[PDB]
């Protein structure tokens, strides 16, 4: 098996639902940040090294391609950070893979981002996210990798991540650049709520019969997950409250 679909959409654009939709279509695994968190935390340092490699005056592109290939072995698709930030590299490695750009209203996106992936540095809720994630074994190394992958997607070394106005403009620019770089016939822009129809047409498959398009990972559910991790201190003890997520 090899990469068939490259998900270029940013975090909080429906990437977990797209991951699930691609797993339904292909009956093979799709990579996502949740693969790292819930199945393979040893991947954190590997991603960090690949991102660090991009910051060298002379980066080793073959080291990056080889590292991506090893990370994605056994997967049919990629979505979410950190992989989305490498969509150009993945297009080169997998010239026959199609590209998906999941997208949504930028104000809704920013709101969701601040609730889940990138709270402002002095937002009290950041401390709660961190306390809940500690239950999962997630610590500062994960947050560094996540933030560095977002900065790499936005092509900025120094950026004030606490400035909403900057993030909104980075979002629009990132999505504009995907549409500029990817040949139209190789790209599907999938707006939140678009469902199976356009996706299945683009991938040359029928709409899965009787299977609805996935709809999980809302910020409401993430807030509940953080709170229940804090309260019970065990993922196993609470996972029955969160079907269809991990
Ligand atoms: N089928 C669907 N229809 C509408 N929104 C969806 C959806 N699947 C996921 N989403 C939204 O996509 C966001 C999650 O994205 P990701 O999986 O990339 O982190 C959440 O936004 P909200 O946080 O605004 O609820 C979630 O509600």
- What CATH number has the domain bearing residue 20? 3.40.50.300
Q: Residue 145 is encoded by which pair of tokens?
A: 């990798």
Three-state DSSP class for residue 218: coil
How far is CA 80 from its chain centroid?
Answer: 1
Return the residue whose CA atom lies nearest to atom 10 of ligand 1.
14
Phi-psi region at 74: left, alpha or beta (left = phi > 0; alpha = psi -120 to 50): left
Ligand 1 pocket member 67 (CB < 6 A) = no
Whether 139 has a binding-site annotation, put simply, is yes
Give, rounded to a whole angstrom, the gap between the first and last alpha carbons of the chain. 22
* Pick from 83, 74, 88: nearest CA to 29: 74
The preferred substitution site among 9, 14, 221 for testing ligand 1, maximizing ligand atoms within 8 Å of CB, is: 14
Phi-psi region at 80: left, alpha or beta (left = phi > 0; alpha = psi -120 to 50): left
* Pick from 76, 79, 109, 91: nearest CA to 8: 79
- CA dist 246 and 243 (Å) reads 8
* Pick from 47, 80, 76: nearest CA to 64: 47
Method by which the coordinates were obtained: X-ray
Residues shown for the chain: 246
- CA dist 32 and 92 (Å) reads 20
What single-letter DSSP state applies at residue 207?
A: P
How many CA atoms lie within 13 Å of 42's alpha carbon, on the beta-carbon side?
3
* Pick from 27, 15, 8, 81: nearest CA to 208: 27
Burial class of 69 by CB neighbour count within 10 A (0 to 12, 13 to 18, 19+): middle
Confirm if 64 and 87 have CB atoms less than 8 A apart: no
Give the range of the structural domain holding residue 55, as residue numbers without chain letter. Answer: 1-246
- CA dist 113 and 11 (Å) reads 7
Q: Which atom of ligand 1 lies nearest, measured to the CA of 221?
A: 25
| β-bridge mates for residue 187, sequence order | 99
Helix (H) or strand (E) holding 241: none
* CA distances to 14, 109, 216 from 192, in Å: 7, 11, 12
How many CA atoms lie within 13 Å of 2's alpha carbon, on the beta-carbon side?
8
* Angle ∠(217,99,95) on CA atoms, nearest 5: 140
Q: Which atom of ligand 1 lies nearest, measured to the CA of 9?
A: 18
Pairing between β-strand 187-191 and β-strand 30-31 as defined by DSSP bridges:
unpaired
Q: Which atom of ligand 1 lies nearest, measured to the CA of 108?
A: 24
Q: What are phi and psi of 188, to 5 degrees?
A: -120, 125
Ligand 1 pocket member 13 (CB < 6 A) = yes
Ligand 1 pocket member 7 (CB < 6 A) = no
- CA dist 201 and 207 (Å) reads 8
Q: Residue 20 is encoded by which pair of tokens?
A: 């699930």
Q: Residue 144 is encoded by which pair of tokens?
A: 């560094």
* Angle ∠(71,207,102) on CA atoms, nearest 5: 50
Return the residue whose CA atom lies nearest to atom 7 of ligand 1.
215
Confirm if 186 and 108 have CB atoms less than 8 A apart: no
- Report the 10 Å Cβ neighbour count for 168: 14
Three-state DSSP class for residue 190: strand
Instruction: Find the 14 Cα to ligand 1 centroid distance in Å.
Output: 4
Q: Which atom of ligand 1 lies nearest, measured to the CA of 104?
A: 12
Please state the domain count of the chain: 1
Residue with tokens 């804090």: 230
Whether 137 has a binding-site annotation, put simply, is yes
- b (16+ CB within 10 A) / e for 177-200: ebeeebeeeebbbbebeebbeebe
- Report the 10 Å Cβ neighbour count for 228: 19
| β-bridge mates for residue 191, sequence order | 103
Q: HEC states along 54-94?
A: HCCCCCCHHHHHHHHHHHCCCCCEECCCCHHHHHHHHHHHC
Q: Residue 229 is encoded by which pair of tokens?
A: 């991790």
Instruction: Find the 133 Cα to ligand 1 centroid distance in Å.
Output: 20
Residue with tokens 């949740």: 34
């Amino acid at each position: 098996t090899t990469i068939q679909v490259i998900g270029a959409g940013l975090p909080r654009t429906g990437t977990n639902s797209m991951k699930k939709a691609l797993e339904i279509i292909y009956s093979k695994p799709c990579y996502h940040m949740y693969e790292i968190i819930f199945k393979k935390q040893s991947d954190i340092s590997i991603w960090q090294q690949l991102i660090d490699e991009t910051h060298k005056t002379t980066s080793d592109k073959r080291k990056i391609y080889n590292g991506l290939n090893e990370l994605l072995n056994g997967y049919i698709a990629t979505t979410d950070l950190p992989s989305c930030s490498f969509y150009k590299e993945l297009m080169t490695m997998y010239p026959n893979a199609k590209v998906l750009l999941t997208i949504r209203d930028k104000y809704d996106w920013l709101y969701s981002l601040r609730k889940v992936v990138l709270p402002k540095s002095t937002d009290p809720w950041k401390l709660k996210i961190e306390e809940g994630d500690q239950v999962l074994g997630i610590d500062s190394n994960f947050y560094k990798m996540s933030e560095d992958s977002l900065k790499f997607a936005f092509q900025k070394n120094h950026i004030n991540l606490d400035d909403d106005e900057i993030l909104l403009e980075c979002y629009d620019e990132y999505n504009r650049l995907v549409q500029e770089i990817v040949p139209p016939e190789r790209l599907l822009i999938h707006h939140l709520g678009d469902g199976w129809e356009s996706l299945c047409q683009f991938l040359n498959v029928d709409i899965p019969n009787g299977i609805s398009y996935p709809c999980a990972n809302s910020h409401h559910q993430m807030t509940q997950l953080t709170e229940q991790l804090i309260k019970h201190k065990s993922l196993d003890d609470i996972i029955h409250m969160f079907p269809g997520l991990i």
